[PDB]
Design a protein around this ligand. Structure first.
Ligand code: HEM
Ligand SMILES: N[C@@H](Cc1c[nH]c2ccccc12)C(=O)O
Ligand SMILES: OCCc1c[nH]c2ccccc12
Ligand SMILES: [C-]#N
Length: 379
């Protein structure tokens, strides 16, 4: 849509990703599809090292290129972390690193597994005729058995899909403001709030499909990166591409465009900077180039917040606040998820840091506080 690559149904997610790569890249696909066994047996690192350097010229279309990022990304996590108990690799082999860095530079992403790879491009629906729902859906790749990566990635994707129904309304909002259509704008804001209220109901599903203790110990360490990590302090070195090591943050739904999309829409100045603003601005370089341009386009438009405040209209303020309260609800709920899935598990292991690399609990509360302080009320 307007070459921002936002689908009506699935939003920022890649609609119907490719499952198979071309025959030339089978050596990659065998390692990626059999990750749980190769890590467990302990021949994952041997297979990656004994591997030819494959050129990325044969990947024709965009879906082929992104599938390769997902394939190469999951292998890079598997190689660096290994069994995930302590033993790590600081150097990444030239035969896998150089094609991955060249592919990453083409798509304007960092050479590391990101939200766009492991959530947005890491899914398939089982029956094409059936609708988008957890029973019908499945991921393409997993790290280990009992990591709960299916339940984890698909619930993130299902909320992304829930937010898509709000994202398609955004043109109506800016069209109504320009054309000076009060009733259209009020209806559009209420529709967005309704869609954001529904995304919170989709969020409830995470308790059914993700074990807290299994998520923290097993899956979290594979999603982690190497930007301010004590295990890789200097960072990872990509052989035959850069001389020194390079630091790149781990995967996180901080790299989701939906969070910033609606804050930017509603004039919630998160990136206006401080400790928390710095992080959210950095995450846009881990987003795809098209979605980075979408968040650009929203900031360029006239402020929806300024428009609503000027009119002296309790109806518009209600509808505006409905959207803002929905965001406060999502962020209030997301903190309860963090309490269950990080804080309580972390205390059982004989300010904690997230995969993105932030003092998470004070970071998230600052972000929620900024959202809550944007409620208009009586003007
Ligand atoms: C077990 C599940 C989850 C955990 C443990 C978790 C944890 C965190 C943590 C620690 C942060 C702070 C940044 C960082 O250090 O990475 C964060 C940020 C964020 N998370 Fe999650 N998260 C989970 C699920 C979700 C889901 C399902 C979504 C959306 C569909 C989401 C959206 C976000 C967003 C947008 C941010 C950026 C800050 C903000 O805008 O509020 N998270 N998450
Ligand atoms: N940031 C989370 C991990 C996480 C949550 N949602 C994600 C989506 C994709 C990749 C990683 C994540 C943590 O520190 O535990
Ligand atoms: O931290 C909560 C995640 C979140 C923030 N804003 C959103 C908008 C839609 C869906 C999820 C979120
Ligand atoms: C959410 N990371």
């Amino acid at each position: 849509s307007k070459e921002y690559h936002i689908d009506e149904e699935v939003g920022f997610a890649l609609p119907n990703p490719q499952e198979n790569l071309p025959d030339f890249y089978n050596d990659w696909m065998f390692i990626a599809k059999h990750l749980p066994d190769l890590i467990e047996s302990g021949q994952l690192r041997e297979r990656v090292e004994k591997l030819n350097m494959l050129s990325i010229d044969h990947l024709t279309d965009h879906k082929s290129q992104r599938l390769a990022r997902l394939v190469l990304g999951c292998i890079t996590m598997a190689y660096v972390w290994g069994k995930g108990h302590g033993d790590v690799r600081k150097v990444l082999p030239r035969n896998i690193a150089v094609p991955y860095c060249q592919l990453s530079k083409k798509l304007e992403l960092p050479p590391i597994l990101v939200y766009a790879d492991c959530v947005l491009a890491n899914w398939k629906k089982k029956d094409p005729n059936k609708p988008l729902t957890y029973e019908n859906m499945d991921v393409l790749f997993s790290f280990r058995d009992g990591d709960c990566s299916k339940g984890f990635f698909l619930v993130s994707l299902l909320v992304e899909i829930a937010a898509a129904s709000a994202i398609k309304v955004i043109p109506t909002v800016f069209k109504a403001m320009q054309m000076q259509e009060r009733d259209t704008l009020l209806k559009a804001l209420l529709e967005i709030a309704s869609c954001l209220e529904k995304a919170l109901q989709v969020f409830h599903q995470i308790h059914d499909h993700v074990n807290p203790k299994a998520f923290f110990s097993v899956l979290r360490i594979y999603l982690s990166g190497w930007k301010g990590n004590p295990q890789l302090s200097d960072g990872l070195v990509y052989e035959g591409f850069w001389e020194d090591p390079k630091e790149f943050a781990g995967g996180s739904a901080g790299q989701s465009s939906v969070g910033q999309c609606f804050d930017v829409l509603l004039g919630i100045q998160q990136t206006a900077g401080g400790h928390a603003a710095q992080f959210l601005q950095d995450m846009r370089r881990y987003m795809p180039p098209a979605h980075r341009n979408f968040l650009c386009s929203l900031e360029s438009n006239p402020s929806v917040r300024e428009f609503v405040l000027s009119k002296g209209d309790a109806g518009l303020r209600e509808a505006y606040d409905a959207c803002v309260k929905a965001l406060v609800s999502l962020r209030s709920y997301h903190l309860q998820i963090v309490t269950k899935y990080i804080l309580i598990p972390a205390s059982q292991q004989p300010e904690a840091k997230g995969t993105g690399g932030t003092d998470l609990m004070n970071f998230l509360k600052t972000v929620r506080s900024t959202t809550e302080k944007s409620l208009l009320k009586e003007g």
